[PDB]
Design a protein around this ligand. Sequence first.
Ligand code: NI
Length: 341
Amino acid sequence: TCPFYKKIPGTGFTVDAFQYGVVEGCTAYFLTHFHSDHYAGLSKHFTFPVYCSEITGNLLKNKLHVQEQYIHPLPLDTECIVNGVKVVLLDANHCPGAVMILFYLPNGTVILHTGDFRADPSMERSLLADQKVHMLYLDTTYCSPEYTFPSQQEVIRFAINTAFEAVTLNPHALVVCGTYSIGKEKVFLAIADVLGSKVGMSQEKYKTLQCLNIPEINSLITTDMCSSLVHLLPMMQINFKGLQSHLKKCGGKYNQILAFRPTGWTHSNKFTRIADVIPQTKGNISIYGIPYSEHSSYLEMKRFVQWLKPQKIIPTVNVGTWKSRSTMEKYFREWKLEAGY
Ligand code: NI
């Protein structure tokens, strides 16, 4: 059944709750972003109002074929009334179109649901600065102090410099980047840009990218693989076997592959720096795992929450085990005692 952490009290609203069939008493289904564990269950046969960003609405229409009459896009940073309740959508700094949602309950309670987010000090100067938030529905993906990672900017710098050096030394080297969802487009776009290439990809992925309102996108991407020296492939194909295979397909246009696997966290984060990362190499193929995260580090999360000073925290991630639940509750209490709310 629909879990309690997907329900917004005092409304008939649910968040990211599309795989339980009809939810008893739900008059509006919000969708924070277009990632499959969150939209799971949506299709052309859905007949309830879906509230979301413009970009998430483009994906629902073009990729899922949800009918236009059930899609209700809202602008960001704008007070809107939905079924008699004031709401605001804020940028979540996750993937394209991802939002946080502020609900202003008739009784005076204010609730923030983060969806998936990477907390950033810039959020401290959005519309959140303007009033008190009583309850926080929090993305707790990396809520443990072992989870450190570099800035997105540091990681892109590394990838750009790595690719540029490699292709400048060998003009017959191919760059490949893995993907399995929207998110992390900066990785392959930044690399393509330094190399004066467009990025080449399948027709399904090009379609997905054309929904995201990226400026000048027609200048940056293409379905013509042969004309491009940065290819995107399914993350599943980013290994020696799938890469050797792929190399054959280009017909001796390239003799070397340099590939990037943008992971979340991996245990080498607890020892190694970004300047000190190394690839796995078999022959003329090298694979780099780069820690490009679209979720809060532990420190970023802790700073956001100690700034917000919520009265109650409801986790939305890692809630399935008693051990995780108890560990998270311990950090929340530490934060509160250190900060004095
Ligand atoms: Ni996500």
